[PDB]
Amino acid sequence: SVYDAAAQLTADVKKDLRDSWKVIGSDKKGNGVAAMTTLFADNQETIGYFKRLGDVSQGMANDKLRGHSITLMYALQNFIDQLDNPDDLVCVVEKFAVNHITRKISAAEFGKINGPIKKVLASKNFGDKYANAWAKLVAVVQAAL
Amino acid sequence: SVYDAAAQLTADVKKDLRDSWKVIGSDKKGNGVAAMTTLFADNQETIGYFKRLGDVSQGMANDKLRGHSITLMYALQNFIDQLDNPDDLVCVVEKFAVNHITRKISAAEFGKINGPIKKVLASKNFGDKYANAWAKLVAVVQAAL
Ligand code: HEM
Ligand code: HEM
């Protein structure tokens, strides 16, 4: 249940998400591409889903990958801005869930983004505490897939 | 090209876009839904394209419409944030262009959004100069359609 999942975002979790987002959200292009390049490197079996982006190994030099990556960060920005209102958070989460259901992405495979996020956070000196908070937000999307 | 259309956005135009967005972008849920409802009210022929959203006459109460509307405002947020780097603006514009090309939305039809934006701007007392500035931004996306 996406609603029960959203309820897991307690005061402490929301604070950790906001505090860490202030840092990682400041460079959407850089951290967005970093997150994607990590996903492709750690889970090569997911590259097939991104055929439209072309040669993803090119990283920042790939215009389609850069456009996709920046936009992905705005989806996260959207989630963060809706933390105050559960009903709005859920409707935006379900919107993005549809974008992935149509691409045949399961909850299990969507969860593969946790590794990349933990690594991007770690590179900014944000440890497991923050990685776990972000896993709870990702879990809300997983509940809708 | 799209790059040409973006590279032409002048300092004055960018100033007007940023000043007006400071206001209309501060209430994404409210202004996003208002923009969509106005599109359906003045251009009823577009309603069919949004069948996935269900009964759009439900307005704010329609969770699918609300989720879509909030997300549309973040696409605009994305554009505004990329104004000083045409290369990044172009790659995000092309990304959203694909979302519409796949739905068979022509450049002419995409331009139907200008009416709603003009009315939303007007509700906050931003006149013709501002509407013209936004039409130029919309024209960048049209260059990709
Ligand atoms: C924090 C997690 C993630 C977020 C917020 C997110 C967000 C997005 C957004 C905003 C889009 C563009 C939607 C569209 O225009 O159709 C997208 C596309 C896509 N996502 Fe994700 N995504 C995430 C994780 C994943 C993961 C882990 C996978 C795969 C294992 C995945 C697979 C896809 C695919 C295949 C596309 C289509 C790309 C294209 O052809 O343009 N996403 N995602
Ligand atoms: C300021 C201009 C506009 C922006 C920034 C914009 C942005 C968006 C975004 C972000 C999406 C979601 C893409 C996806 O998840 O697949 C979308 C979907 C869509 N847009 Fe637009 N759009 C604009 C104008 C228009 C206009 C004028 C039309 C029609 C005449 C249009 C038709 C569509 C359709 C049919 C969808 C698919 C809705 C669905 O089934 O979820 N858009 N748009």
Swiss-Prot record, chains A, B:
Superkingdom field: Eukaryota
Main location: cytoplasm
Cytoplasm in keyword set: yes
Record: residues binding heme b: 100
Location of this chain's protein in the cell: Cytoplasm
The Globin domain, residue ranges: 8-145
Annotated organism of origin: Anadara inaequivalvis
Top-level taxonomy: Eukaryota, Metazoa, Spiralia, Lophotrochozoa, Mollusca
Keyword Transferase: no
Similarity field: Belongs to the globin family.
Subunit structure and binding partners: Homodimer.
Coiled-coil ranges (or none): none
GO MF, any single term: identical protein binding
Protein name, as recorded: Globin-1
GO cellular component, one term: cytoplasm
Keywords: Cytoplasm, Heme, Iron, Metal-binding, Oxygen transport, Transport
Gene3D superfamilies given in the database record: Globins
